[PDB]
Tab-separated table of C-alpha atoms in Angstrom:
chain	number	residue	atom	x	y	z
A	1010	UNK	CA	64.191	128.454	148.411
A	1011	UNK	CA	66.677	127.672	145.622
A	1012	UNK	CA	67.929	130.266	143.139
A	1013	UNK	CA	66.713	128.163	140.210
A	1014	UNK	CA	63.394	127.327	141.872
A	1015	UNK	CA	62.434	130.606	143.563
A	1016	UNK	CA	63.361	132.824	140.602
A	1017	UNK	CA	61.240	130.513	138.442
A	1018	UNK	CA	58.471	130.476	141.042
A	1019	UNK	CA	58.184	134.254	141.478
A	1020	UNK	CA	58.258	134.712	137.700
A	1021	UNK	CA	55.346	132.267	137.355
A	1022	UNK	CA	53.198	132.588	140.486
A	1023	UNK	CA	53.452	136.348	139.994
A	1024	UNK	CA	51.809	135.778	136.632
A	1025	UNK	CA	48.916	134.105	138.470
A	1026	UNK	CA	48.560	137.296	140.508
A	1027	UNK	CA	48.242	139.082	137.168
A	1028	UNK	CA	45.718	136.550	135.848
A	1029	UNK	CA	43.505	136.319	138.949
A	1030	UNK	CA	43.018	140.069	139.429
A	1031	UNK	CA	42.356	141.174	135.844
A	1032	UNK	CA	38.788	140.566	134.706
A	1033	UNK	CA	39.084	138.762	131.372
A	1034	UNK	CA	35.339	139.093	130.821
A	1035	UNK	CA	35.772	142.882	130.575
A	1036	UNK	CA	37.710	142.798	127.264
A	1037	UNK	CA	41.227	141.920	128.395
A	1038	UNK	CA	43.806	139.536	126.974
A	1039	UNK	CA	47.432	138.931	127.889
A	1040	UNK	CA	50.171	137.364	125.787
A	1041	UNK	CA	52.994	135.347	127.343
A	1042	UNK	CA	56.430	135.409	125.720
A	1043	UNK	CA	59.334	133.195	126.809
A	1044	UNK	CA	62.565	135.106	126.418
A	1045	UNK	CA	65.523	135.395	128.682
A	1046	UNK	CA	66.976	138.778	129.547
A	1047	UNK	CA	70.375	137.948	128.061
A	1048	UNK	CA	68.736	136.631	124.887
A	1049	UNK	CA	66.761	139.816	124.329
A	1050	UNK	CA	69.710	142.201	123.998
A	1051	UNK	CA	71.331	139.694	121.630
A	1052	UNK	CA	68.108	139.768	119.600
A	1053	UNK	CA	68.435	143.542	119.310
A	1054	UNK	CA	72.069	142.963	118.371
A	1055	UNK	CA	70.694	140.422	115.860
A	1056	UNK	CA	68.938	142.907	113.587
A	1057	UNK	CA	70.675	146.005	112.168
A	1058	UNK	CA	67.579	148.094	112.937
A	1059	UNK	CA	64.978	147.900	115.717
A	1060	UNK	CA	62.302	147.797	112.985
A	1061	UNK	CA	63.562	144.347	111.935
A	1062	UNK	CA	64.113	142.769	115.363
A	1063	UNK	CA	62.513	139.618	116.709
A	1064	UNK	CA	60.794	141.404	119.571
A	1065	UNK	CA	59.480	143.946	117.053
A	1066	UNK	CA	57.697	141.043	115.379
A	1067	UNK	CA	55.765	140.144	118.525
A	1068	UNK	CA	55.080	143.651	119.838
A	1069	UNK	CA	54.297	145.504	116.612
A	1070	UNK	CA	53.618	143.241	113.661
A	1071	UNK	CA	51.863	140.242	115.198
A	1072	UNK	CA	49.672	142.605	117.211
A	1073	UNK	CA	49.300	146.268	116.348
A	1074	UNK	CA	50.721	146.137	112.829
A	1075	UNK	CA	48.179	143.581	111.656
A	1076	UNK	CA	44.824	143.792	109.916
A	1077	UNK	CA	42.241	142.903	112.544
B	611	UNK	CA	84.714	120.147	97.377
B	612	UNK	CA	83.411	122.052	100.386
B	613	UNK	CA	82.363	124.978	98.172
B	614	UNK	CA	79.969	122.619	96.386
B	615	UNK	CA	78.634	121.637	99.822
B	616	UNK	CA	77.754	125.271	100.563
B	617	UNK	CA	75.802	125.513	97.300
B	618	UNK	CA	73.927	122.253	97.949
B	619	UNK	CA	73.132	123.354	101.509
B	620	UNK	CA	71.843	126.618	99.991
B	621	UNK	CA	68.378	125.331	99.086
B	622	UNK	CA	67.490	128.295	96.839
B	623	UNK	CA	69.890	127.235	94.042
B	624	UNK	CA	71.088	123.810	95.190
B	625	UNK	CA	70.693	121.179	92.393
B	626	UNK	CA	72.710	123.067	89.704
B	627	UNK	CA	69.818	124.645	87.803
B	628	UNK	CA	70.305	128.408	87.340
B	629	UNK	CA	72.621	130.980	88.888
B	630	UNK	CA	74.970	128.449	90.488
B	631	UNK	CA	78.061	129.761	88.681
B	632	UNK	CA	77.393	133.390	89.647
B	633	UNK	CA	76.808	132.652	93.345
B	634	UNK	CA	79.931	130.463	93.385
B	635	UNK	CA	81.860	133.557	92.288
B	636	UNK	CA	80.134	135.474	95.091
B	637	UNK	CA	81.330	133.234	97.908
B	638	UNK	CA	84.929	132.988	96.680
B	639	UNK	CA	85.278	136.748	96.174
B	640	UNK	CA	84.177	137.622	99.719
B	641	UNK	CA	86.645	135.223	101.369
B	642	UNK	CA	89.609	136.805	99.537
B	643	UNK	CA	88.860	140.189	101.154
B	644	UNK	CA	87.703	138.737	104.495
B	645	UNK	CA	91.265	138.389	105.852
B	646	UNK	CA	91.580	142.139	106.464
B	647	UNK	CA	89.182	141.824	109.413
B	648	UNK	CA	88.148	138.392	110.681
B	649	UNK	CA	84.546	138.248	111.890
B	650	UNK	CA	81.860	135.536	111.992
B	651	UNK	CA	78.303	136.937	111.934
B	652	UNK	CA	75.922	137.225	108.966
B	653	UNK	CA	74.231	140.592	109.841
B	654	UNK	CA	77.623	142.191	110.429
B	655	UNK	CA	78.643	140.529	107.151
B	656	UNK	CA	75.578	142.156	105.578
B	657	UNK	CA	77.268	145.368	106.688
B	658	UNK	CA	80.721	144.000	105.802
B	659	UNK	CA	79.478	143.311	102.269
B	660	UNK	CA	78.273	146.929	102.239
B	661	UNK	CA	81.613	148.038	103.702
B	662	UNK	CA	83.208	146.226	100.751
B	663	UNK	CA	80.854	148.112	98.405
B	664	UNK	CA	81.537	151.621	99.730
B	665	UNK	CA	85.288	151.023	99.452
B	666	UNK	CA	84.644	149.504	96.012
B	667	UNK	CA	82.746	152.597	94.853
B	668	UNK	CA	85.693	154.717	95.993
B	669	UNK	CA	87.772	152.645	93.571
B	670	UNK	CA	85.307	152.774	90.666
B	671	UNK	CA	83.909	156.311	90.819
B	672	UNK	CA	87.404	157.753	91.169
B	673	UNK	CA	88.188	155.982	87.893
B	674	UNK	CA	84.909	157.065	86.279
B	675	UNK	CA	85.722	160.643	87.218
B	676	UNK	CA	88.852	160.151	85.108
B	677	UNK	CA	87.560	158.198	82.119
B	678	UNK	CA	85.011	160.984	81.995
C	244	UNK	CA	33.309	118.132	141.611
C	245	UNK	CA	30.259	117.692	139.370
C	246	UNK	CA	26.634	118.311	140.297
C	247	UNK	CA	24.396	115.403	139.398
C	248	UNK	CA	21.991	116.716	136.755
C	249	UNK	CA	19.446	115.236	134.374
C	250	UNK	CA	19.322	115.154	130.618
C	251	UNK	CA	18.179	118.538	129.236
C	252	UNK	CA	14.735	118.744	127.706
C	253	UNK	CA	11.572	120.812	127.016
C	254	UNK	CA	10.842	120.309	130.622
C	255	UNK	CA	12.688	122.550	132.992
C	256	UNK	CA	15.976	121.470	134.546
C	257	UNK	CA	16.538	122.859	138.036
C	258	UNK	CA	20.033	122.364	139.456
C	259	UNK	CA	20.801	123.497	142.896
C	260	UNK	CA	23.693	125.726	142.314
C	261	UNK	CA	25.635	125.147	145.451
C	262	UNK	CA	27.721	127.798	143.892
C	263	UNK	CA	27.114	131.494	144.208
C	264	UNK	CA	27.968	133.499	141.078
C	265	UNK	CA	29.934	136.313	139.383
C	266	UNK	CA	29.485	138.499	136.273
C	267	UNK	CA	31.423	139.520	133.114
C	268	UNK	CA	32.197	142.520	130.826
C	269	UNK	CA	33.385	143.250	127.238
C	270	UNK	CA	35.148	145.998	125.135
C	271	UNK	CA	36.635	146.808	121.632
C	272	UNK	CA	40.083	145.392	120.883
C	273	UNK	CA	40.899	144.372	124.492
C	274	UNK	CA	43.738	146.161	126.283
C	275	UNK	CA	46.215	143.440	125.331
C	276	UNK	CA	49.443	143.291	127.313
C	277	UNK	CA	52.494	141.195	126.546
C	278	UNK	CA	54.151	139.826	129.670
C	279	UNK	CA	57.755	139.179	128.676
C	280	UNK	CA	60.372	137.534	130.860
C	281	UNK	CA	62.108	134.329	131.889
C	282	UNK	CA	59.394	131.759	132.558
C	283	UNK	CA	61.310	128.455	132.395
C	284	UNK	CA	64.571	127.127	133.752
C	285	UNK	CA	66.856	127.321	130.719
C	286	UNK	CA	67.562	129.233	127.507
C	287	UNK	CA	65.753	127.883	124.448
C	288	UNK	CA	67.879	127.251	121.372
C	289	UNK	CA	65.329	128.534	118.849
C	290	UNK	CA	65.771	132.188	117.805
C	291	UNK	CA	63.231	134.716	118.937
C	292	UNK	CA	61.482	135.315	115.601
C	293	UNK	CA	60.169	131.725	115.432
C	294	UNK	CA	58.879	131.044	118.940
C	295	UNK	CA	55.302	131.914	119.765
C	296	UNK	CA	53.246	133.870	122.287
C	297	UNK	CA	50.555	132.013	124.217
C	298	UNK	CA	47.320	133.631	125.406
C	299	UNK	CA	46.429	133.018	129.062
C	300	UNK	CA	43.204	133.687	130.856
C	301	UNK	CA	41.765	132.340	134.116
C	302	UNK	CA	40.278	129.238	132.513
C	303	UNK	CA	43.334	128.061	130.566
C	304	UNK	CA	46.089	128.860	133.050
C	305	UNK	CA	46.198	125.216	134.147
C	306	UNK	CA	46.720	124.123	130.524
C	307	UNK	CA	49.422	126.690	129.738
C	308	UNK	CA	51.355	125.587	132.819
C	309	UNK	CA	51.056	121.900	131.914
C	310	UNK	CA	52.222	122.281	128.304
C	311	UNK	CA	55.191	124.452	129.241
C	312	UNK	CA	56.874	121.474	130.984
C	313	UNK	CA	58.613	123.478	133.687
C	314	UNK	CA	61.270	120.891	134.582
C	315	UNK	CA	63.456	122.234	137.390
C	316	UNK	CA	66.557	120.071	137.917
C	317	UNK	CA	68.969	121.342	140.561
C	318	UNK	CA	71.330	120.062	143.235
C	319	UNK	CA	70.222	121.045	146.736
C	320	UNK	CA	71.552	120.358	150.220
C	321	UNK	CA	70.932	116.981	151.861
C	322	UNK	CA	69.409	117.433	155.323
C	323	UNK	CA	67.978	113.905	155.640
C	324	UNK	CA	71.049	112.456	157.401
C	325	UNK	CA	73.805	113.489	159.831
C	326	UNK	CA	76.004	114.830	156.996
C	327	UNK	CA	76.389	118.584	156.562
C	328	UNK	CA	78.503	118.336	153.383
C	329	UNK	CA	76.067	116.086	151.490
C	330	UNK	CA	74.086	117.136	148.422
C	331	UNK	CA	71.042	115.627	146.764
C	332	UNK	CA	69.755	116.500	143.273
C	333	UNK	CA	66.016	116.487	142.596
C	334	UNK	CA	63.723	116.002	139.598
C	335	UNK	CA	60.587	118.133	139.314
C	336	UNK	CA	57.672	117.960	136.870
C	337	UNK	CA	55.058	120.701	137.247
C	338	UNK	CA	51.609	120.417	135.681
C	339	UNK	CA	49.331	122.439	137.991
C	340	UNK	CA	49.529	125.320	140.456
C	341	UNK	CA	49.280	122.767	143.295
C	342	UNK	CA	52.594	121.270	142.130
C	343	UNK	CA	54.396	124.167	143.811
C	344	UNK	CA	52.967	122.955	147.135
C	345	UNK	CA	55.098	120.601	149.298
C	346	UNK	CA	52.516	117.816	148.933
C	347	UNK	CA	53.432	117.437	145.254
C	348	UNK	CA	57.084	118.499	145.505
C	349	UNK	CA	57.867	115.821	148.092
C	350	UNK	CA	55.825	113.309	146.067
C	351	UNK	CA	58.211	113.858	143.142
C	352	UNK	CA	61.293	113.319	145.332
C	353	UNK	CA	61.783	109.555	145.932
C	354	UNK	CA	63.764	110.207	149.123
C	355	UNK	CA	60.652	111.953	150.478
C	356	UNK	CA	58.151	109.426	149.115
C	357	UNK	CA	59.402	107.009	151.789
C	358	UNK	CA	59.075	109.625	154.544
C	359	UNK	CA	55.443	110.527	153.848
C	360	UNK	CA	54.789	106.776	153.599
C	361	UNK	CA	56.568	106.534	156.946
C	362	UNK	CA	54.202	109.152	158.385
C	363	UNK	CA	51.112	107.560	156.801
C	364	UNK	CA	52.156	104.311	158.491
C	365	UNK	CA	52.414	106.174	161.822
C	366	UNK	CA	49.052	107.955	161.515
C	367	UNK	CA	47.537	104.525	160.785
C	368	UNK	CA	49.028	103.207	164.033
C	369	UNK	CA	47.677	105.932	166.351
C	370	UNK	CA	44.006	105.031	165.797
C	371	UNK	CA	44.030	101.404	166.986
C	372	UNK	CA	46.914	102.084	169.410
C	373	UNK	CA	45.270	103.482	172.546
C	374	UNK	CA	41.941	101.704	172.041
C	375	UNK	CA	43.104	98.127	172.724
C	376	UNK	CA	45.262	97.948	175.894
C	377	UNK	CA	46.650	94.516	174.905
C	378	UNK	CA	49.265	96.075	172.602
C	379	UNK	CA	51.616	96.900	175.491
C	380	UNK	CA	51.168	93.344	176.794
C	381	UNK	CA	52.931	92.045	173.674
C	382	UNK	CA	55.507	94.839	173.609
C	383	UNK	CA	56.949	93.111	176.675
C	384	UNK	CA	56.693	89.812	174.795
C	385	UNK	CA	58.717	91.412	172.004
C	386	UNK	CA	60.993	92.601	174.814
C	387	UNK	CA	61.264	88.936	175.837
C	388	UNK	CA	61.369	87.371	172.347
C	389	UNK	CA	64.283	89.310	170.868
C	390	UNK	CA	65.347	86.638	168.356
C	391	UNK	CA	62.034	86.232	166.517
C	392	UNK	CA	61.442	90.000	166.497
C	393	UNK	CA	64.606	90.888	164.561
C	394	UNK	CA	63.934	88.125	162.020
C	395	UNK	CA	60.614	89.811	161.174
C	396	UNK	CA	61.941	93.386	160.997
C	397	UNK	CA	63.977	92.541	157.886
C	398	UNK	CA	60.820	91.318	156.118
D	374	UNK	CA	66.362	163.423	119.825
D	375	UNK	CA	64.543	161.187	117.333
D	376	UNK	CA	61.092	159.664	117.726
D	377	UNK	CA	61.062	155.954	117.015
D	378	UNK	CA	58.861	155.498	113.942
D	379	UNK	CA	58.056	152.694	111.529
D	380	UNK	CA	58.682	152.347	107.839
D	381	UNK	CA	56.122	154.377	105.842
D	382	UNK	CA	53.495	152.482	103.905
D	383	UNK	CA	49.904	152.318	102.547
D	384	UNK	CA	48.938	151.689	106.078
D	385	UNK	CA	48.756	154.711	108.286
D	386	UNK	CA	51.739	155.803	110.359
D	387	UNK	CA	50.787	157.457	113.643
D	388	UNK	CA	53.638	159.137	115.520
D	389	UNK	CA	53.004	160.696	118.818
D	390	UNK	CA	54.212	164.145	118.253
D	391	UNK	CA	55.540	164.962	121.646
D	392	UNK	CA	56.035	168.238	119.964
D	393	UNK	CA	53.426	170.926	119.652
D	394	UNK	CA	53.570	172.880	116.378
D	395	UNK	CA	53.904	176.213	114.523
D	396	UNK	CA	52.886	177.567	111.090
D	397	UNK	CA	54.461	179.337	108.063
D	398	UNK	CA	53.833	182.104	105.459
D	399	UNK	CA	55.040	183.182	101.966
D	400	UNK	CA	55.319	186.321	99.698
D	401	UNK	CA	56.709	187.641	96.311
D	402	UNK	CA	60.428	188.421	96.193
D	403	UNK	CA	61.003	188.258	99.983
D	404	UNK	CA	61.982	191.450	101.807
D	405	UNK	CA	65.677	190.596	101.569
D	406	UNK	CA	68.017	192.438	103.915
D	407	UNK	CA	71.796	192.435	103.833
D	408	UNK	CA	73.335	192.443	107.299
D	409	UNK	CA	76.796	193.927	106.842
D	410	UNK	CA	79.436	194.208	109.539
D	411	UNK	CA	82.441	192.643	111.232
D	412	UNK	CA	81.554	189.024	111.955
D	413	UNK	CA	84.976	187.416	112.514
D	414	UNK	CA	88.112	188.279	114.426
D	415	UNK	CA	90.406	189.579	111.687
D	416	UNK	CA	90.497	191.367	108.330
D	417	UNK	CA	90.337	189.055	105.318
D	418	UNK	CA	92.970	189.587	102.641
D	419	UNK	CA	90.648	189.030	99.673
D	420	UNK	CA	89.160	192.211	98.154
D	421	UNK	CA	85.487	192.881	98.589
D	422	UNK	CA	84.343	192.180	95.020
D	423	UNK	CA	85.309	188.483	95.237
D	424	UNK	CA	84.006	187.383	98.633
D	425	UNK	CA	80.473	186.086	98.892
D	426	UNK	CA	77.260	186.645	100.836
D	427	UNK	CA	75.762	183.692	102.693
D	428	UNK	CA	72.025	183.222	103.238
D	429	UNK	CA	70.980	182.414	106.815
D	430	UNK	CA	67.668	181.209	108.099
D	431	UNK	CA	66.660	179.465	111.332
D	432	UNK	CA	67.475	175.987	110.049
D	433	UNK	CA	70.960	176.671	108.671
D	434	UNK	CA	72.295	179.045	111.312
D	435	UNK	CA	74.215	176.192	112.948
D	436	UNK	CA	75.906	175.397	109.616
D	437	UNK	CA	76.808	179.000	108.776
D	438	UNK	CA	78.429	179.382	112.192
D	439	UNK	CA	80.405	176.149	111.820
D	440	UNK	CA	81.794	176.926	108.355
D	441	UNK	CA	82.820	180.457	109.299
D	442	UNK	CA	85.526	179.088	111.652
D	443	UNK	CA	85.328	181.874	114.211
D	444	UNK	CA	88.760	181.336	115.788
D	445	UNK	CA	89.273	183.845	118.600
D	446	UNK	CA	92.896	183.888	119.803
D	447	UNK	CA	93.662	186.459	122.492
D	448	UNK	CA	95.803	186.918	125.585
D	449	UNK	CA	93.722	187.281	128.745
D	450	UNK	CA	94.550	187.677	132.426
D	451	UNK	CA	95.631	184.655	134.468
D	452	UNK	CA	93.516	184.344	137.621
D	453	UNK	CA	94.264	180.658	138.292
D	454	UNK	CA	97.240	181.336	140.597
D	455	UNK	CA	98.457	183.898	143.153
D	456	UNK	CA	100.006	186.096	140.426
D	457	UNK	CA	98.305	189.360	139.483
D	458	UNK	CA	100.735	190.194	136.647
D	459	UNK	CA	100.357	186.851	134.840
D	460	UNK	CA	98.725	186.400	131.438
D	461	UNK	CA	97.400	183.327	129.679
D	462	UNK	CA	96.504	183.106	125.970
D	463	UNK	CA	93.605	180.911	124.870
D	464	UNK	CA	92.561	179.032	121.730
D	465	UNK	CA	88.884	178.956	120.766
D	466	UNK	CA	87.062	177.004	118.050
D	467	UNK	CA	83.348	177.763	117.703
D	468	UNK	CA	80.996	175.465	115.804
D	469	UNK	CA	77.603	175.938	117.504
D	470	UNK	CA	75.711	178.542	119.516
D	471	UNK	CA	76.418	176.472	122.656
D	472	UNK	CA	80.147	177.087	122.124
D	473	UNK	CA	79.689	180.582	123.554
D	474	UNK	CA	78.603	178.956	126.830
D	475	UNK	CA	81.249	178.378	129.556
D	476	UNK	CA	80.774	174.601	129.311
D	477	UNK	CA	82.396	174.611	125.862
D	478	UNK	CA	84.717	177.590	126.378
D	479	UNK	CA	86.374	175.996	129.410
D	480	UNK	CA	86.486	172.659	127.559
D	481	UNK	CA	88.646	174.313	124.885
D	482	UNK	CA	91.046	175.765	127.476
D	483	UNK	CA	93.430	173.005	128.685
D	484	UNK	CA	94.093	174.853	131.953
D	485	UNK	CA	90.353	174.569	132.658
D	486	UNK	CA	89.981	170.992	131.404
D	487	UNK	CA	91.855	169.887	134.537
D	488	UNK	CA	89.633	171.989	136.813
D	489	UNK	CA	86.314	170.601	135.568
D	490	UNK	CA	87.919	167.148	135.809
D	491	UNK	CA	88.888	168.158	139.339
D	492	UNK	CA	85.251	169.019	140.083
D	493	UNK	CA	83.921	165.857	138.405
D	494	UNK	CA	86.269	163.896	140.672
D	495	UNK	CA	84.836	165.752	143.694
D	496	UNK	CA	81.175	165.260	142.733
D	497	UNK	CA	81.991	161.548	142.352
D	498	UNK	CA	83.344	161.509	145.912
D	499	UNK	CA	80.310	163.088	147.622
D	500	UNK	CA	77.938	160.214	146.782
D	501	UNK	CA	79.763	157.331	148.494
D	502	UNK	CA	81.280	159.678	151.112
D	503	UNK	CA	78.600	160.051	153.789
D	504	UNK	CA	76.985	156.661	153.167
D	505	UNK	CA	79.796	154.444	154.509
D	506	UNK	CA	81.069	155.714	157.901
D	507	UNK	CA	84.285	153.651	157.605
D	508	UNK	CA	85.954	156.298	155.418
D	509	UNK	CA	86.875	158.483	158.408
D	510	UNK	CA	88.256	155.392	160.166
D	511	UNK	CA	90.974	155.169	157.504
D	512	UNK	CA	91.517	158.928	157.324
D	513	UNK	CA	93.092	158.515	160.762
D	514	UNK	CA	95.065	155.568	159.379
D	515	UNK	CA	96.320	157.883	156.637
D	516	UNK	CA	96.992	160.316	159.484
D	517	UNK	CA	99.068	157.535	161.068
D	518	UNK	CA	100.657	156.121	157.888
D	519	UNK	CA	102.208	159.296	156.488
D	520	UNK	CA	105.015	157.584	154.546
D	521	UNK	CA	102.889	155.247	152.413
D	522	UNK	CA	100.314	157.985	151.760
D	523	UNK	CA	102.735	160.418	150.098
D	524	UNK	CA	104.191	157.634	147.937
D	525	UNK	CA	100.715	157.057	146.465
D	526	UNK	CA	99.830	160.729	145.912
D	527	UNK	CA	102.516	161.034	143.223
D	528	UNK	CA	100.961	158.125	141.300
């Protein structure tokens, strides 16, 4: 019931509720990215354009913008 | 000799092989104009280099509309 | 949790599946989602463009949780004594989903390792306690012999 | 009002056109018409043989209107007070088709900039007004404390 424990328990046991329900045999995969919410806006402040950000690398280019 | 330390930490042209006298003129020229607005961030400096090129082209093209 | 089976062979190898069983399905490029958000107890010093994304399904969730090293270190309130204004920091190391349970949280707190060991010593007493009625006969002897009793409590 | 797209490339660049779409047509020398008539609020001092004709289509109508500088300066009736025989001149600067609308006409009248700001201050009040019922408890305190209330209204 601590603010460091419970916020890091709901953010992780709630993932298990997303893993247990979704049938991974029926063509499903899920990627897990460790950011923090204050880091992510800084990472959009990092690049001059959203098409060169660090989250753009993991959403677009490592996935969708990739051969195969 | 801290300017030599920045060249040796720059691993692209560190051990005095080629282009080390041109890039030494690049670091020392940017610091002389940096005192108009103090800021410490490379991607803003990638815009602050460009903001020192737009103001430079106002100095050059106004002269090259007079030599022509 | 392993069924005893035989070596496989050209003969047929029946194994009572005490289990019942499920099924599976498949698609094209799977509907891949990216769950993003704070999953550990700090802020990592590496920039975002170098850290990686890990793929989790039902079979490898116990291995993704173990290799994350979710180490939660915090100072919480001390309610083990008569002090209200006392605090007691903890040290947690999580490797499975059962490490959230109070059996493994209290096992990682040394102030609570002695209290479960206290309870395990009391559950061990209750079995042979009411079976032999000669225990209360020597409780009065320990009521009589007060000097030799306190010399043995320190041991 | 810009769709987020990627850099173009030899790979294919799908962009959800939330839009639907039209079509176009072409001819020989187009049927060119010359719309002539009073389009500004004065009489220009240059003679006719020197001034120019500007070409307007659907894409550049916002730029032809901006560079015309339609500045309409007139004295109109003052209906902001209890005076019937009062007049109030205005100053208008039109740069888009939305500048004919009363959102941008009243924004260019300084006597109406304080009345929309008055309304924006009253729409801001209505949200937190009826949610907390302790506001009327201090309206009676402002009914009691009349001296300190009027000292703060001038600020």
